[PDB]
Design a protein around this nucleic acid. Structure first.
Ligand SMILES: [Mg+2]
Ligand SMILES: [Zn+2]
Lengths: 204, 80, 128, 60, 113, 145, 99
RNA sequence: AAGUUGGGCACUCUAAGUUGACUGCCGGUGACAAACCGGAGGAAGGUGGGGAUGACGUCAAAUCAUCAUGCCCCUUAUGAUUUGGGCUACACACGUGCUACAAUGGACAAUACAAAGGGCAGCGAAACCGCGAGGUCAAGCAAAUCCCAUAAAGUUGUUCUCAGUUCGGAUUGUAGUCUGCAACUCGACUACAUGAAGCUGGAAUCGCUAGUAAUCGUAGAUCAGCAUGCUACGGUGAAUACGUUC
RNA sequence: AGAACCUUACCAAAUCUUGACAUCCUUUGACAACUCUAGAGAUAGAGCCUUCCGGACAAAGUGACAGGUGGUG
């Protein structure tokens, strides 16, 4: 019933995460990118990987990993980043160059917030307290608005429901607004709990 | 296949099985799943147990049955 | 020379129209207007701007028109003729505007909507 | 889709006409686009994520 | 009267010749061109030599009762051999692989609710 | 459930006769957008009536519409009678003219229309009968006004 | 004696900036450039059933639009060729050179 | 022969950037307000026309068969391979459409005017062969270049003359083409013949307020082949809205 | 947004049980397109025979384990 805000804004005020062109091997390139992304996600779960951009030119693959914990991904001696490079080169015959981008305020990143609240739910925290503290810190860090939602068998109840909290302005119908959206899933003993977070850090 | 430029279709295994024991007059029944095989004049006087889906219906080949498929004589659906 | 050039549009039809001092003959795509157009009402509509401006038969018209159908091209030619007359004499602006000929008819074919047979027509509904 | 079915689609077919396309992301046999090798559902999901170069919502 | 069948007197020859079983529009035109005769001339305003030539051309086309007998013999042969088409002819159902759940009236007769 | 009355369309005069009524009659006759077919039909009918009457085609047409235009109608509510608007008069006249013309037995639509307009001018047409029935039922229900 | 450069990109912004970059590089190297010429854009529309199951009447329509730019170099020079072949464009745009 | 080439970027067009429309100005109704109506100017006037965008909530509405997933269930089978047959059946009832019942038409010959898409082992030009669907050779084209691809309705001439017909094309016989290892069940199309009902449809019921309805074709996704479905495109182009009683 | 085979989830018949598919563990390769025979095939029997860098990779056996378009929206 609600359009995915990222989907609505892609190509208007939000750039694609896949930056390249093709005419013949579009499908093969696309699915190569998909498997690269799946491998990065499976391997950097602990790292606060906000998102990943992929470009390709001159038979090279440029990966840009925007993360909130760049030290963990790089490694003290570059060992981790070199290992990741090597594994990506093993997966794809082409040559991969990886860059890491630091996110200063992880509490204003929708994906990071969604993953944090989902982890807390898996740890069996309070589905209300988690959202309240999330929104509180996001609002104190200058966010113009934030909305959190958690749906599923909240407290283990047989009947699944959803509850959400909001603060400030989140104008989802404004196409100008650069609204950051993320969805995550907690795999609780009772099943899948879906957490959604919308963040509006203001005009930029 | 159907086009004249291509010869009437028939499974090579079915054709060779029919050709086998051609000289002997004690011709037997030939089990076949090839409902799609065309009926050649070589088949006249033969008995083909053609699979219709669950059982092999016996079919006796005559001259008037030349040019048709073996499946046309082993109906698949049952009604009344 | 003394060419008065102008463009006219209607639906998907564009007519480049050039007016020259002449006897009233209209050529369209190197063909006579009364042969190109399948009805004389279209010719009368083409001449309508000339009647409004009171310069009927004082110009020969050369038309390069493509796009649309015959009605669309005829009205595009009329629009081009009105624009050319404007270019030739600004004093005809009032007469042409009152006649309603300087307006580029903005009506176009509405897209088809998904879930509908046409732009508006919807599938036949049946309760139960 | 069934893993055995995906495997049977990947494997070579003795016929050549016996080849059919499956969505390479989930395995749905129906409604698979050739340009992306994706079913409509995966295409929509990835277009929303912005991970299909140059693909955005259309309107006119 | 050609091939033992009367043809409309006031109808053009090309159209009127279609009333002969086995003669349609294409064969009517072909016959009329083989036996030189005006296309628009009505059969009533026709010459005996033209009629004789038309009969001569028609007699060998294998039309009317012979055509009917040949078609019936084919249908009876496919019924007798016990073919699928023969079974469907016996049961009065579509033979050329139509769907009988709906829209089979021309083979199944009127609706029997 | 309606805010009010919407603006009404205005049609251009007939290119040759310069008559709004003629334009709207052409539109009424037109089916599936075949404006050319409608134009040729109307013009042939006008020529036929001019020939058969020795009188102006526009004159006889205007007399036929005046004859077949009603003044009273009835709307279900029992049917209550009510006066007809001036534009409704022309609409109904043209609609009935075309309908009964199409219902005539002549071979071609041009002949049907010509005969029907002639009968309406003589006051002995199907459209005239329609108008007469409408007036009769309006008078019968005059009380409910 | 002309050289054609065809650029194609999903973003008209990036394609315009790359076209300006290559035109500037050619004019610096010294050659004369006629363009850029915007060829008609090619728009491919994809209509998807929005719902996972049934609900045919609800659809979503995506597009991929590729914009096309043409550049003509008239008076080529070795410097121009070297600069064009050494120039690096954004990963998004695809460049084809016909000498 | 051709915008075919020599030449030009005028025009059109293409596509980036910009200007434009905001009840802005004027006059009436209105409580000097909002607003409504009319007018000037303008290509466009009253959210100019459409699209996307779908709040808080409702129906334990749909989906465990796109995907994921708690719990339960089978594991020598509820898993797996192959050939063949179902999903295409057929005394019947319903929804959605295609084709018609004809003269605002059928047939024949000539001749115009669109838009939007697709093309790599894919679009297959011209030529030759066959009446035909199609076959052989084969140019160009990874695209504003070449092809798909001659739009149809229309216009102009001849014929039919109100007839179940020169309407209509279901039905089936025979003989072909094309794809596919393979058209029996169970593809499409083509030639010849056959030529059913149907002569504007009871109760009832549906869409639509303008480039809309209605008609005419055109293209694409899937796809070896198979569209009356779906999604888009344009050609021609209406009628009516008094009113809120139901 | 494409049921003759495939799709296909259903049925008949002919067949397999670490399995059509994935990871680990032991051995180690020349595995396998290709030609022969029997079969409707899936598959089985002998050859031919071609690859491979401290190891990618690929075959055989065993045990974990796989598998389900099965149910509950
Ligand atoms: Mg809005
Ligand atoms: Zn998918």
């Amino acid at each position: 019933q609600k359009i995915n805000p990222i989907g609505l804004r892609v190509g208007i005020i939000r750039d694609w995460e896949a930056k390249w062109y093709a005419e013949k091997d579009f499908a093969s390139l696309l699915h190569e990118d998909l498997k690269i992304r799946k491998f990065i996600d499976n391997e950097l779960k602990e790292a606060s990987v906000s998102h990943v951009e992929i470009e390709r030119a001159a038979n090279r693959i440029n990966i840009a990993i925007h993360t909130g914990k760049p030290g963990m991904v790089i490694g003290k001696g570059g060992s981790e980043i070199e290992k990741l490079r090597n594994k990506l080169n093993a997966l794809t015959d082409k040559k991969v160059h990886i860059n890491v981008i630091e996110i200063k305020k992880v509490d204003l990143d929708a994906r990071l917030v969604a993953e944090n609240i989902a982890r807390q739910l898996e740890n069996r925290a309070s589905f209300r307290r988690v959202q309240k503290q999330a929104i509180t810190r996001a609002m104190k860090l200058g966010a113009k608005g934030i909305k959190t939602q958690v749906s599923g068998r909240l407290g283990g109840a047989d009947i699944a429901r959803a509850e959400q909290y909001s603060e400030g302005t989140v104008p989802l119908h404004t196409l100008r607004a650069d609204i950051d959206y993320a969805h995550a899933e907690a795999d609780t003993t009772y099943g899948k709990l879906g957490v959604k977070v919308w963040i509006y850090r203001g005009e930029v | 296949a159907r086009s004249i430029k291509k010869g009437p279709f028939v499974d090579e295994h079915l054709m060779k099985k029919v050709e086998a024991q051609e000289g002997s007059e004690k011709k037997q029944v030939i089990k076949t799943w090839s409902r799609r095989s065309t009926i050649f004049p070589n088949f006249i006087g033969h008995t083909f147990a053609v699979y219709d889906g669950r059982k092999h219906v016996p079919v006796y080949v005559t001259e008037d049955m030349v040019g048709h498929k073996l499946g046309e004589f082993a109906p698949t659906r049952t009604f009344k | 020379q003394v060419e008065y050039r102008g463009t006219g549009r209607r639906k998907n039809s564009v007519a480049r129209v050039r007016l020259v001092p002449g006897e009233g003959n209209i050529t369209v795509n190197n063909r006579d207007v009364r042969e190109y157009l399948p009805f004389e009402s279209l010719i009368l509509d083409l001449n309508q701007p000339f009647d409004v401006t009171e310069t009927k038969g004082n110009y020969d018209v050369l038309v390069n028109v493509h796009g649309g159908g015959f009605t669309g091209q005829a009205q595009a030619i009329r629009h081009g003729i009105a624009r050319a007359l404007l270019e030739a004499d600004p004093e005809y602006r009032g007469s042409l505007k009152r006649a309603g000929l300087l307006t580029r008819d903005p009506r176009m074919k509405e897209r088809k909507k998904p879930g509908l047979k046409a732009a508006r027509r919807s599938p036949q509904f049946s309760k139960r | 889709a069934k893993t055995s079915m995906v495997a049977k689609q990947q494997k070579k077919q003795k016929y050549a006409v016996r080849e059919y396309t499956r969505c390479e992301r989930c395995g749905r046999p129906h409604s698979v686009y050739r340009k992306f090798k994706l079913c409509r559902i995966c295409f929509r999901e990835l277009a929303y994520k912005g991970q299909i170069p140059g693909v955005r919502k259309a309107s006119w | 009267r050609i091939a033992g069948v009367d043809i409309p007197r006031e109808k053009r020859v090309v159209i009127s010749l279609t009333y002969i079983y086995g003669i349609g529009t294409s064969t009517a035109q072909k016959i009329l061109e083989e036996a030189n005769v005006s296309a628009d001339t009505r059969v009533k305003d026709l010459t005996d030599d033209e009629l004789g030539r038309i009969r001569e051309v028609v007699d060998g086309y294998k039309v009317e009762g012979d055509l009917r007998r040949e078609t019936n013999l084919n249908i009876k042969r496919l019924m007798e051999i016990s073919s699928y088409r023969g079974i469907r002819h016996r049961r009065g159902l579509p033979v050329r692989g139509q769907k009988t759940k709906n829209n089979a009236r021309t083979r199944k007769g009127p609706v029997k609710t | 459930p309606r805010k009010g009355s919407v603006p009404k369309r205005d049609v251009l005069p007939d290119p040759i006769h310069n008559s709004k009524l003629v334009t709207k009659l052409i539109n009424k006759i037109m089916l599936d957008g075949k404006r050319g077919t409608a134009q040729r039909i109307l013009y042939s009918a006008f020529d036929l009536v001019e020939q058969r009457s020795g009188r102006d085609a526009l004159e006889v047409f205007e007399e036929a519409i005046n004859n077949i235009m009603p003044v009273l109608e009835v709307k279900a509510r029992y049917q209550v009678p009510v006066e007809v608007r001036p534009e409704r008069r022309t609409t109904l006249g043209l609609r009935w003219l075309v309908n009964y013309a199409r219902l005539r037995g002549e071979k071609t639509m041009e002949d049907r229309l010509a005969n029907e307009i002639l009968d309406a001018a003589n006051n002995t047409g199907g459209a005239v009968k329609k108008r007469e029935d409408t007036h009769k039922m309006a008078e019968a229900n005059k009380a409910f006004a | 004696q002309k050289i054609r450069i065809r650029l194609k990109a999903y973003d008209h912004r990036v394609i315009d900036q790359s076209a300006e970059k290559i035109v500037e590089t050619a004019k610096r190297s010294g050659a004369d450039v006629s363009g850029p010429i915007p060829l008609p854009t090619e728009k491919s529309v994809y209509t998807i059933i929005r719902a996972v199951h049934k609900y045919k009447d609800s659809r979503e329509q995506f597009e991929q639009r590729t914009h096309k730019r043409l550049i003509d170099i008239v008076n080529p020079t070795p410097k121009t060729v070297d600069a064009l072949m050494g120039l690096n464009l954004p990963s998004g745009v695809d460049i084809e050179i016909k000498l």
